[PDB]
């Protein structure tokens, strides 16, 4: 039955082609979820950095209030606030950098998944 063999093999072309199409659908959908997770991480970083900003308002405010009633002024009295403002800037720089590391990890995971899907599609095609 040559026709039977052709029908069976045609089913293999159907099996591999839909299997490969599904590999792309699953890999493409996972990547979208990772992108949404990265966006949510960005939003969380923004919220925590805003909290850091609000704490800074009260912190630098107190420095100005105390250094304002001291009756001394000068260079050392400005170095007190300058060093404090710097600590807040560096702390925010860390929130902004921890986010970059997380995004890089997501990027690497997405590339790994895409490469795996590519290799699987090659395997399916090679039959």
């Amino acid at each position: 039955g040559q026709n039977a063999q052709a029908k069976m093999i045609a089913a293999q072309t159907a099996a591999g082609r839909r299997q490969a199409m599904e590999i792309m659908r699953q890999t493409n959908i996972q990547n979208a979820d990772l992108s949404l997770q990265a966006r949510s991480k960005l939003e969380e970083a923004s919220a925590e950095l805003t909290s850091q900003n609000m704490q800074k308002v009260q912190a630098i405010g107190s420095i100005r209030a105390a250094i304002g009633e001291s009756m001394l002024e000068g260079s050392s009295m400005d170095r007190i606030k300058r060093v404090t403002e710097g600590q807040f800037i560096r702390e925010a720089n860390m929130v902004t950098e921890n986010y970059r590391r997380d995004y890089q990890a997501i990027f690497a995971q997405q590339l790994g998944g895409t490469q795996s899907a590519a290799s699987q599609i090659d395997e399916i095609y090679k039959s």
Binding site: M21, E22, M24, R25, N28, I29, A32, D33, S35, L36, R39
Partner: protein, 50 residues
């Protein structure tokens, strides 16, 4: 006078509708996601442009 449409991202198989002044001005259907070419279709900036 004006507004904004923040685009967090694109998910495959969903539909996007913008309703302004009682009119569904924008209607887009993201493909299922089997073709790799749909990366642009799900991209945030490409979707915003569309």
């Amino acid at each position: 006078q004006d507004g904004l449409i923040n685009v967090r991202g694109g998910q495959y198989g969903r539909e996007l509708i913008v309703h302004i002044n009682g009119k569904d001005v924008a209607k887009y259907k993201i493909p299922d996601g089997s073709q790799p070419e749909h990366v642009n279709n799900t991209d945030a900036q490409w979707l915003a442009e569309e």
